[PDB]
C-alpha cells in the first residue's frame, strides 16, 4: 500500500510548495492521478486476498471502498474551492491538508491487517473531520455538531478498544488473516453478551443505527460541502466495513444478539424515510435519507448471508456516490441563494435546465431505479431478508414507496412549479459545477455495466 | 454601533468580470487550466482508460476459470458414470465421528 500512501503524503508538500494561484490546480491534478493508479488494486483472486505485507492487505471488500475514497478527494477539492475563494492562502492550504490527511487515514484504515491498527486509524479520522466541521462550517450550530459527532463516536469506540485488547490476550493475535483460522465459537454467557456489544456498538453508532443517529443530522448539515461529501460517502462506511470484518469472530451469538438491532433498523428505516417527507431543510432531508439507506446495510450485515453481504457491499458504494452527488447538488443552490430551506427557491428547472437533469438523475439513483447499482444492492438485501423472514417484505416494500415519495418530492419542490419572483441572482451553472455532478453520476452508471467489481468478497 | 465589525461583503458574480468564466478561478488563465486538468485527468484518463482497464481485467476472481473447470469435471464424471456432485465435501474415510 506504500504505492498509495507515499503519493498521498506528497500531496501535502505539493500543496504547500505550489504557487499561490495554483494550489487548486496542482492538488486536483495529482489527486486524480492517484485515483487512477488505485485501479491496480483490482487484482483480486477467487480464493485468496491480495496480501501485501505484515501491515496491509486488500480484498474485494476494501478495494472498492479504497477506489471510492481516492476518487472523492479531487471531487471535494472541486466542490470546496468556490466557497473558500476569499479565505487567506495559509488557511486554504490547511483546509486542503485536512482533506489529504483524512484520505491518508482512510486508505490505511481500509487495508489495515490488524484490528488494533484498524482501530487507531479508525479513530484517527475523527480529528481532521472535527476540524473541518468546526473551523470551516458556516453556522453557529457547527460547534454543537462537532461535539455530538465526537462524543457519540468515542462513547462507542472506547468499549471497542477494551474488547479488541481482550481478544488479543485470549486469541494471541488481532491479525485478520489469523483470526480467519483461529476463530472459536462464542459461548452464550453474560460476559460474551457485553463483548458482543463492545465489538459492535462503535460501528453501529457510525452507520448510524436508528436511535443512535442524532449526531448525523447535525454533523452532515453543519459541515462545509467537502465535509458532507466525505462524511456521507466514506465515513459512514467505516461502520459497515468494521461490522463486516468483526462479525467473523462473533458467531453464533449474532444469531440472537442481532434481533434488537434488526428491529431498530427495519422500523428505523421507515421512521427516517417518513421524516424526509416533512423536512424543511434540503441538506437535512438528504442527511436523513442516508440514515434510511444505511439501515439496510445494518440489517444485511446482521443476517450474515452471502446474498446480504453482496448487497451490503453494493449499497455502500452506490450510496456513497449518490449521497455525495445530492449534497453537491444542494450546495450549488445554496451558493446562489445562501439558504438551505427547500421551499425558498422553486422552479429552478426553468432557470437552470442542465442542472435540473443532474437533479433528476440523482433522484432516480436515490430511489433505486433498475438497473442502477443502487437497485442491485437494495434488491439483493431484500432477497436475503425475505429468506430470513418472509414478513420483512412488508417493511421493505413500504420503505421503497416512501423513498420514491421523498426523492421526487425534493425534485418537484425545488425544480418544478413557478420560480420565486424575488430571487433574481440565479446565474447560469458553472463548468465546474457541471463537471462536479457528472463525475459522480458517470462512474455510478458505468458500474452498472460491470457490477461484479463492487459486490465484495462473497461474489 | 456596538463593536467595530466589517459589514458583510456582497456576493461576487464571476461572470461579471469574466463572461467566459468556467467557475474555477478569478484569474482567466488559471481558470482555464483548472478546467483542462479536471476534464483531461477526470474524463479522458480516469473514466475512459479506467473503464477500458476494468473491462479487460484478467479473469476477475477466477469466474471464467471455474466455468472451464466445471465443464472439465462434468465431462469426466458423466463419461465414467459418477455422480455429477456428491453430498459429502470431504471423504468419510478421513473423518472419525465421536462415540
Amino acid at each position: 500500500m506504500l504505492k498509495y500512501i507515499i503519493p498521498t503524503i506528497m500531496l501535502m508538500p505539493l500543496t504547500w510548495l505550489s504557487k499561490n494561484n495554483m494550489i487548486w490546480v496542482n492538488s486536483t491534478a495529482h489527486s486524480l492521478l492517484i485515483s487512477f493508479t488505485s485501479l491496480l488494486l483490482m487484482n483480486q483472486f477467487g480464493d485468496n486476498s491480495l496480501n501485501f505485507s505484515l501491515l496491509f492487505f486488500s480484498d474485494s471488500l476494501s478495494t472498492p471502498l479504497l477506489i471510492l475514497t481516492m476518487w472523492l478527494l479531487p471531487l471535494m477539492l472541486m466542490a470546496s474551492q468556490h466557497h473558500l475563494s476569499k479565505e487567506n492562502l495559509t488557511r486554504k492550504k490547511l483546509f486542503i491538508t485536512m482533506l489529504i490527511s483524512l484520505q491518508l487515514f482512510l486508505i490505511m484504515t481500509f487495508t489495515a491487517m490488524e484490528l488494533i491498527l484498524f482501530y487507531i486509524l479508525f479513530e484517527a479520522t475523527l480529528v481532521p473531520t472535527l476540524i473541518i466541521i468546526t473551523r470551516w462550517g458556516n453556522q453557529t450550530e457547527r460547534l454543537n455538531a462537532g461535539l455530538y459527532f465526537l462524543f457519540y463516536t468515542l462513547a462507542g469506540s472506547l468499549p471497542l478498544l477494551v474488547a479488541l485488547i481482550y481478544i488479543q490476550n485470549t486469541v494471541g493475535s488481532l491479525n485478520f488473516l489469523m483470526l480467519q483460522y483461529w476463530v472459536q465459537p462464542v459461548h452464550n454467557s453474560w460476559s460474551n453478551v457485553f463483548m458482543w456489544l463492545a465489538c459492535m456498538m462503535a460501528f453501529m453508532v457510525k452507520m448510524p443505527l436508528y436511535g443512535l443517529h442524532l449526531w448525523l443530522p447535525k454533523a452532515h448539515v453543519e459541515a462545509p460541502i467537502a465535509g458532507s461529501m466525505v462524511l456521507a460517502a466514506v465515513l459512514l462506511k467505516l461502520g459497515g466495513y468494521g461490522m463486516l470484518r468483526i462479525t467473523l469472530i462473533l458467531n453464533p451469538m449474532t444469531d440472537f444478539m442481532a434481533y434488537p438491532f434488526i428491529m431498530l433498523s427495519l422500523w428505523g428505516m421507515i421512521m427516517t424515510s417518513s421524516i424526509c417527507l416533512r423536512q424543511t431543510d434540503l441538506k437535512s432531508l438528504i442527511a436523513y435519507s442516508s440514515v434510511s439507506h444505511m439501515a439496510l446495510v445494518i440489517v444485511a450485515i446482521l443476517i450474515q448471508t452471502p446474498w446480504s453481504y453482496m448487497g451490503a457491499t453494493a449499497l455502500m458504494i452506490a450510496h456513497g456516490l449518490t449521497s455525495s452527488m445530492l449534497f453537491c447538488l444542494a450546495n450549488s443552490n445554496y451558493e446562489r441563494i445562501h439558504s438551505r430551506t427547500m421551499i425558498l427557491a422553486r422552479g429552478l428547472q426553468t432557470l437552470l435546465p442542465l442542472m435540473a437533469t443532474w437533479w433528476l438523475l440523482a433522484s432516480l439513483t436515490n430511489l433505486a431505479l433498475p438497473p442502477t447499482i443502487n437497485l442491485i444492492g437494495e434488491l439483493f438485501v431484500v432477497m436475503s431478508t425475505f429468506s430470513w423472514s418472509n414478513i420483512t417484505i412488508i417493511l421493505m416494500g413500504v420503505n421503497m414507496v416512501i423513498t420514491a415519495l421523498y426523492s421526487l418530492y425534493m425534485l418537484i419542490m425545488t425544480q418544478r412549479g413557478k420560480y420565486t419572483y424575488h430571487i433574481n441572482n440565479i446565474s447560469p451553472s458553472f463548468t465546474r459545477e457541471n463537471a462536479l455532478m457528472s463525475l459522480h453520476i458517470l462512474p455510478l452508471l458505468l458500474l452498472t455495466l460491470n457490477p461484479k467489481i463492487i459486490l465484495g468478497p462473497l461474489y | 454601533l456596538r463593536w467595530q465589525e466589517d459589514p458583510e461583503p456582497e456576493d461576487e458574480n464571476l461572470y461579471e468580470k469574466n463572461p467566459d468564466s468556467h467557475g474555477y478561478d478569478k484569474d482567466p488563465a488559471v481558470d482555464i487550466w483548472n478546467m483542462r486538468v479536471v476534464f483531461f485527468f477526470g474524463f479522458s484518463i480516469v473514466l475512459v482508460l479506467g473503464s477500458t482497464f476494468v473491462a479487460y481485467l484478467p479473469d476477475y476472481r477466477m469466474q471464467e476459470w471455474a466455468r472451464r473447470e466445471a465443464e472439465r469435471l462434468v465431462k469426466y464424471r458423466e463419461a465414467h458414470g459418477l455422480p455429477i456432485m456428491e453430498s459429502n465435501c470431504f471423504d468419510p474415510s478421513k473423518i472419525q465421528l465421536p462415540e
Binding site: N138, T140, H338 | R2, W3, E8, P9
Partner: peptide, 19 residues
Amino acid sequence: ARQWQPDVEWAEQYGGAVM
C-alpha cells in the same frame, strides 16, 4: 452569507467566575 464567528454575547459566556 459570511461564516458566523463568536460575538460579544457568545464570548461573555466564558468570562464569568464559573461556567
